[PDB]
Coordinates of all heavy atoms in Angstrom, one line a residue:
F11 N 294.4 -57.0 -4.1 CA 295.0 -57.4 -5.4 C 295.3 -56.1 -6.2 O 294.5 -55.1 -6.1 CB 294.0 -58.3 -6.2 CG 292.7 -57.7 -6.5 CD1 292.6 -57.0 -7.7 CD2 291.6 -57.8 -5.8 CE1 291.4 -56.5 -8.1 CE2 290.4 -57.3 -6.1 CZ 290.3 -56.6 -7.2
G12 N 296.4 -56.2 -7.0 CA 296.7 -55.0 -7.7 C 297.3 -53.9 -6.9 O 297.3 -52.7 -7.4
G13 N 297.8 -54.1 -5.7 CA 298.3 -53.1 -4.9 C 297.2 -52.2 -4.3 O 297.6 -51.0 -3.9
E14 N 296.0 -52.6 -4.3 CA 294.9 -51.8 -3.7 C 294.0 -52.7 -2.9 O 293.9 -53.9 -3.2 CB 294.1 -51.1 -4.8 CG 295.0 -50.2 -5.8 CD 294.2 -49.5 -6.8 OE1 293.0 -49.3 -6.6 OE2 294.7 -49.2 -7.9
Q15 N 293.3 -52.0 -2.0 CA 292.3 -52.7 -1.1 C 290.9 -52.7 -1.8 O 290.1 -51.9 -1.3 CB 292.3 -52.2 0.3 CG 293.7 -52.3 1.0 CD 294.0 -53.7 1.3 OE1 293.2 -54.7 1.1 NE2 295.3 -54.0 1.7
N16 N 290.7 -53.4 -2.8 CA 289.5 -53.4 -3.6 C 288.4 -54.2 -2.8 O 288.6 -55.3 -2.5 CB 289.7 -54.0 -4.9 CG 290.8 -53.3 -5.8 OD1 290.5 -52.3 -6.5 ND2 292.0 -53.8 -5.7
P17 N 287.3 -53.5 -2.4 CA 286.3 -54.3 -1.7 C 285.5 -55.2 -2.6 O 285.2 -54.9 -3.8 CB 285.3 -53.2 -1.2 CG 285.5 -52.1 -2.2 CD 286.9 -52.1 -2.6
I18 N 285.3 -56.4 -2.2 CA 284.6 -57.4 -2.9 C 283.4 -57.9 -2.2 O 283.5 -58.4 -1.1 CB 285.6 -58.6 -3.2 CG1 286.9 -58.1 -3.9 CG2 284.9 -59.7 -4.1 CD1 286.7 -57.5 -5.2
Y19 N 282.2 -57.8 -2.8 CA 281.0 -58.2 -2.2 C 280.8 -59.8 -2.4 O 280.3 -60.2 -3.4 CB 279.8 -57.5 -2.8 CG 279.7 -56.1 -2.3 CD1 280.2 -55.0 -3.0 CD2 279.0 -55.8 -1.1 CE1 280.1 -53.7 -2.5 CE2 278.9 -54.5 -0.7 CZ 279.4 -53.5 -1.4 OH 279.3 -52.1 -0.9
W20 N 281.4 -60.5 -1.4 CA 281.3 -62.0 -1.5 C 279.8 -62.5 -1.4 O 279.5 -63.6 -2.0 CB 282.1 -62.6 -0.4 CG 281.7 -62.3 0.9 CD1 282.1 -61.3 1.7 CD2 280.7 -63.0 1.8 NE1 281.5 -61.3 3.0 CE2 280.6 -62.3 3.0 CE3 279.9 -64.1 1.5 CZ2 279.8 -62.8 4.0 CZ3 279.1 -64.5 2.5 CH2 279.0 -63.9 3.7
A21 N 279.0 -61.7 -0.8 CA 277.6 -62.2 -0.7 C 276.9 -62.3 -2.1 O 276.0 -63.1 -2.2 CB 276.8 -61.2 0.2
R22 N 277.4 -61.5 -3.1 CA 276.8 -61.6 -4.4 C 276.9 -63.1 -4.9 O 276.0 -63.6 -5.4 CB 277.5 -60.6 -5.3 CG 277.0 -59.2 -5.3 CD 277.1 -58.5 -6.6 NE 278.5 -58.2 -6.8 CZ 279.2 -57.0 -6.5 NH1 278.5 -56.1 -5.9 NH2 280.5 -56.9 -6.9
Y23 N 278.1 -63.7 -4.8 CA 278.3 -65.0 -5.3 C 277.5 -66.0 -4.5 O 277.0 -67.0 -5.0 CB 279.8 -65.4 -5.2 CG 280.6 -64.4 -6.0 CD1 281.2 -63.3 -5.5 CD2 281.0 -64.7 -7.3 CE1 282.0 -62.4 -6.2 CE2 281.8 -63.9 -8.1 CZ 282.3 -62.7 -7.5 OH 283.1 -61.9 -8.3
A24 N 277.3 -65.8 -3.2 CA 276.5 -66.6 -2.3 C 275.1 -66.6 -2.8 O 274.4 -67.6 -2.9 CB 276.6 -66.2 -0.9
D25 N 274.6 -65.4 -3.2 CA 273.2 -65.3 -3.8 C 273.1 -66.1 -5.0 O 272.2 -66.9 -5.2 CB 272.9 -63.8 -4.0 CG 271.4 -63.6 -4.5 OD1 270.7 -64.6 -4.3 OD2 271.1 -62.5 -4.9
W26 N 274.1 -65.9 -6.0 CA 274.1 -66.7 -7.2 C 274.2 -68.1 -7.0 O 273.7 -69.0 -7.7 CB 275.2 -66.2 -8.1 CG 275.1 -64.7 -8.5 CD1 274.0 -64.0 -8.5 CD2 276.2 -63.8 -8.8 NE1 274.3 -62.6 -8.9 CE2 275.7 -62.6 -9.0 CE3 277.6 -64.0 -8.9 CZ2 276.4 -61.4 -9.4 CZ3 278.4 -62.9 -9.2 CH2 277.8 -61.6 -9.5
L27 N 275.0 -68.6 -5.9 CA 275.3 -69.9 -5.7 C 274.0 -70.7 -5.3 O 273.8 -71.8 -5.8 CB 276.3 -70.1 -4.5 CG 276.7 -71.5 -4.2 CD1 277.4 -72.2 -5.4 CD2 277.7 -71.5 -3.0
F28 N 273.1 -70.1 -4.5 CA 271.9 -70.8 -4.1 C 270.7 -70.5 -5.0 O 269.7 -71.3 -4.9 CB 271.5 -70.3 -2.7 CG 272.5 -70.8 -1.6 CD1 273.4 -70.0 -1.1 CD2 272.4 -72.1 -1.2 CE1 274.3 -70.4 -0.2 CE2 273.4 -72.6 -0.3 CZ 274.3 -71.7 0.3
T29 N 270.7 -69.5 -5.9 CA 269.6 -69.1 -6.7 C 269.7 -69.6 -8.1 O 268.7 -69.8 -8.8 CB 269.3 -67.6 -6.6 OG1 270.4 -67.0 -7.2 CG2 269.1 -67.2 -5.2
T30 N 270.9 -69.7 -8.7 CA 271.2 -70.2 -10.0 C 270.7 -71.6 -10.2 O 270.1 -71.9 -11.2 CB 272.6 -70.0 -10.4 OG1 273.5 -70.6 -9.5 CG2 273.0 -68.6 -10.6
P31 N 271.0 -72.6 -9.2 CA 270.5 -73.9 -9.4 C 269.0 -74.0 -9.3 O 268.3 -74.8 -10.1 CB 271.1 -74.7 -8.3 CG 271.4 -73.7 -7.3 CD 271.8 -72.4 -8.0
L32 N 268.3 -73.2 -8.5 CA 266.9 -73.2 -8.4 C 266.3 -72.8 -9.7 O 265.3 -73.4 -10.2 CB 266.4 -72.3 -7.3 CG 266.7 -72.8 -5.8 CD1 266.3 -71.7 -4.8 CD2 266.1 -74.1 -5.5
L33 N 266.8 -71.7 -10.3 CA 266.3 -71.3 -11.6 C 266.5 -72.4 -12.7 O 265.5 -72.6 -13.5 CB 267.1 -70.0 -12.0 CG 266.6 -69.3 -13.3 CD1 267.1 -70.0 -14.6 CD2 265.1 -69.1 -13.3
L34 N 267.6 -73.0 -12.7 CA 267.8 -74.2 -13.6 C 266.8 -75.2 -13.5 O 266.4 -76.0 -14.4 CB 269.2 -74.7 -13.5 CG 270.4 -73.8 -13.9 CD1 271.7 -74.5 -13.6 CD2 270.3 -73.5 -15.4
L35 N 266.2 -75.4 -12.2 CA 265.2 -76.4 -12.0 C 263.9 -76.0 -12.6 O 263.2 -76.9 -13.1 CB 265.1 -76.6 -10.5 CG 264.1 -77.7 -10.0 CD1 264.4 -79.0 -10.7 CD2 264.2 -77.9 -8.5
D36 N 263.5 -74.7 -12.6 CA 262.3 -74.3 -13.2 C 262.4 -74.5 -14.7 O 261.4 -74.9 -15.4 CB 262.1 -72.8 -12.9 CG 261.7 -72.5 -11.5 OD1 261.5 -73.5 -10.7 OD2 261.5 -71.4 -11.1
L37 N 263.6 -74.4 -15.3 CA 263.8 -74.6 -16.7 C 263.8 -76.1 -17.0 O 263.3 -76.6 -18.0 CB 265.0 -73.9 -17.2 CG 265.2 -72.4 -17.1 CD1 266.5 -71.9 -17.6 CD2 264.0 -71.8 -17.9
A38 N 264.4 -76.9 -16.1 CA 264.5 -78.3 -16.3 C 263.1 -78.9 -16.3 O 262.7 -79.7 -17.2 CB 265.3 -79.0 -15.3
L39 N 262.2 -78.6 -15.3 CA 260.9 -79.1 -15.2 C 260.1 -78.7 -16.3 O 259.1 -79.3 -16.7 CB 260.3 -78.8 -13.8 CG 261.0 -79.3 -12.6 CD1 260.3 -78.8 -11.3 CD2 261.0 -80.8 -12.6
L40 N 260.3 -77.5 -16.8 CA 259.6 -76.9 -17.9 C 259.7 -77.9 -19.2 O 258.8 -78.3 -19.8 CB 260.0 -75.5 -18.2 CG 259.2 -74.8 -19.4 CD1 257.7 -74.7 -19.1 CD2 259.8 -73.4 -19.6
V41 N 261.0 -78.0 -19.6 CA 261.3 -78.9 -20.7 C 261.2 -80.4 -20.3 O 261.4 -81.2 -21.3 CB 262.7 -78.6 -21.3 CG1 262.8 -77.1 -21.7 CG2 263.8 -79.0 -20.3
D42 N 261.0 -80.7 -19.1 CA 261.0 -82.1 -18.6 C 262.2 -82.9 -19.1 O 262.2 -83.9 -19.7 CB 259.7 -82.8 -19.2 CG 259.4 -84.2 -18.5 OD1 260.2 -84.5 -17.7 OD2 258.5 -84.8 -19.0
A43 N 263.4 -82.4 -18.6 CA 264.6 -83.1 -18.9 C 264.9 -84.2 -17.9 O 264.3 -84.2 -16.7 CB 265.8 -82.1 -18.8
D44 N 265.6 -85.2 -18.4 CA 265.9 -86.3 -17.5 C 266.9 -86.0 -16.4 O 267.5 -84.9 -16.5 CB 266.6 -87.5 -18.4 CG 267.8 -87.0 -19.1 OD1 267.9 -85.8 -19.4 OD2 268.7 -87.9 -19.3
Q45 N 266.9 -86.8 -15.4 CA 267.7 -86.5 -14.2 C 269.2 -86.4 -14.6 O 269.9 -85.6 -13.9 CB 267.6 -87.6 -13.1 CG 266.1 -87.7 -12.6 CD 266.0 -88.7 -11.5 OE1 266.9 -89.5 -11.2 NE2 264.8 -88.9 -11.0
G46 N 269.7 -87.1 -15.6 CA 271.1 -87.0 -16.0 C 271.4 -85.6 -16.5 O 272.4 -85.0 -16.1
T47 N 270.5 -85.0 -17.3 CA 270.8 -83.7 -17.8 C 270.7 -82.7 -16.7 O 271.5 -81.7 -16.7 CB 269.7 -83.3 -18.8 OG1 269.7 -84.3 -19.9 CG2 269.9 -82.0 -19.4
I48 N 269.8 -82.9 -15.7 CA 269.7 -81.9 -14.6 C 271.0 -82.0 -13.7 O 271.6 -80.9 -13.4 CB 268.5 -82.2 -13.7 CG1 267.2 -82.2 -14.6 CG2 268.4 -81.3 -12.6 CD1 265.9 -82.5 -13.9
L49 N 271.4 -83.2 -13.4 CA 272.6 -83.3 -12.4 C 273.8 -82.7 -13.1 O 274.7 -82.1 -12.5 CB 272.9 -84.8 -12.1 CG 274.0 -85.0 -11.2 CD1 274.0 -84.2 -9.9 CD2 274.1 -86.5 -10.9
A50 N 274.0 -82.8 -14.5 CA 275.1 -82.2 -15.1 C 275.0 -80.7 -15.1 O 276.1 -80.0 -14.9 CB 275.1 -82.7 -16.6
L51 N 273.8 -80.1 -15.3 CA 273.7 -78.7 -15.3 C 273.9 -78.1 -13.9 O 274.6 -77.1 -13.7 CB 272.3 -78.3 -15.8 CG 271.9 -78.5 -17.3 CD1 270.5 -78.2 -17.6 CD2 272.8 -77.6 -18.1

């Protein structure tokens, strides 16, 4: 993109993809949010 071969670490997004929801679960169980709030997050 942009006329250059810019390297993109796609594994970074994979890491965020599987670890961001787990983190949200620690916060959900902490505040004891309902399943509706969790599924939306």
Side-chain angles (χ1 to χ4, degrees):
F11 63 88
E14 305 180 26
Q15 299 295 349
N16 302 273
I18 306 297
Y19 286 92
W20 62 269
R22 279 208 290 266
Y23 301 90
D25 187 13
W26 302 333
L27 184 60
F28 292 103
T29 63
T30 51
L32 294 175
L33 187 281
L34 292 175
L35 183 53
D36 291 354
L37 300 177
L39 298 177
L40 182 60
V41 304
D42 189 4
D44 59 330
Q45 298 181 356
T47 303
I48 300 175
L49 181 54
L51 288 173

